[PDB]
Ligand binder design. Sequence first.
Ligand SMILES: *[C@@H]1O[C@H](CO)[C@@H](O[C@@H]2O[C@H](CO)[C@@H](O[C@@H]3O[C@H](CO)[C@@H](O)[C@H](O[C@H]4O[C@H](CO)[C@@H](O)[C@H](O)[C@@H]4O)[C@@H]3O[C@@H]3OC[C@@H](O)[C@H](O)[C@H]3O)[C@H](O)[C@H]2NC(C)=O)[C@H](O)[C@H]1NC(C)=O
Length: 200
Amino acid sequence: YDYFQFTQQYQLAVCNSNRTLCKDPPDKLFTVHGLWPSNMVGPDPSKCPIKNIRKREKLLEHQLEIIWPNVFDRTKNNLFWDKEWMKHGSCGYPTIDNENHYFETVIKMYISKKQNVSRILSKAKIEPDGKKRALLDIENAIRNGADNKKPKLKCQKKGTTTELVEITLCSDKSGEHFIDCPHPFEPISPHYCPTNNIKY
Ligand SMILES: *[C@@H]1O[C@H](CO)[C@@H](O[C@@H]2O[C@H](CO)[C@@H](O[C@@H]3O[C@H](CO)[C@@H](O)[C@H](O[C@H]4O[C@H](CO)[C@@H](O)[C@H](O)[C@@H]4O)[C@@H]3O[C@@H]3OC[C@@H](O)[C@H](O)[C@H]3O)[C@H](O)[C@H]2NC(C)=O)[C@H](O)[C@H]1NC(C)=O
């Protein structure tokens, strides 16, 4: 892999995204959607051969229930985390050593390193108040909490309302320094965030 994408999702909007109902009530919070070893050119790696097989402890799972829930059905959390490890975590060796280290690394980014996107936005005076916002104000807020580096944003359109859904912070191969995210969505895409009137 070349770099990492750490993607967080705003639960309220995810649960308004498609024909799959969230059986559990969402919070107005950004929690983790993925940590993806990624490639600068072409497709990202997927399902890389593993180097070890490990069991998760309850305490790790309890933190992931809070920081990385399956927002559609929390009863499917274990199989959901197993797939994130198998599809993505497995491709980050040796920076990511094993399954437990993969999830501990995500918790370290979100909590210790203050990468909780709800917190970064709140520090810039942007709360989940359901207001229409300019794209640059959301981008400026994230860059101010991420070493000036440009995030990748995902939005969705619902009727006449476009809402913010995901924010990705990208980092270098070691995951120790942020980098600008390559590959932003093109304007024709229904995942593209327009310059104005984004609801959050
Ligand atoms: C990801 O980041 C988000 C955004 O920062 C975290 O969510 C935010 O979490 C804080 C708590 O840490 C929460 O604030 C509390 O909200 C409740 C309900 O409205 C209040 O009752 C709380 O006030 C009481 O407690 C504080 C002590 O923390 C005390 O100072 C108050 O007087 C009172 O006893 C508290 O409100 C905060 O009070 C302090 C003030 O400085 C803050 O401005 C005010 O918010 C936020 O509501 C919550 N924000 C959101 C958008 O939900 C989230 O926890 C974090 N995720 C993880 C896993 O860490």
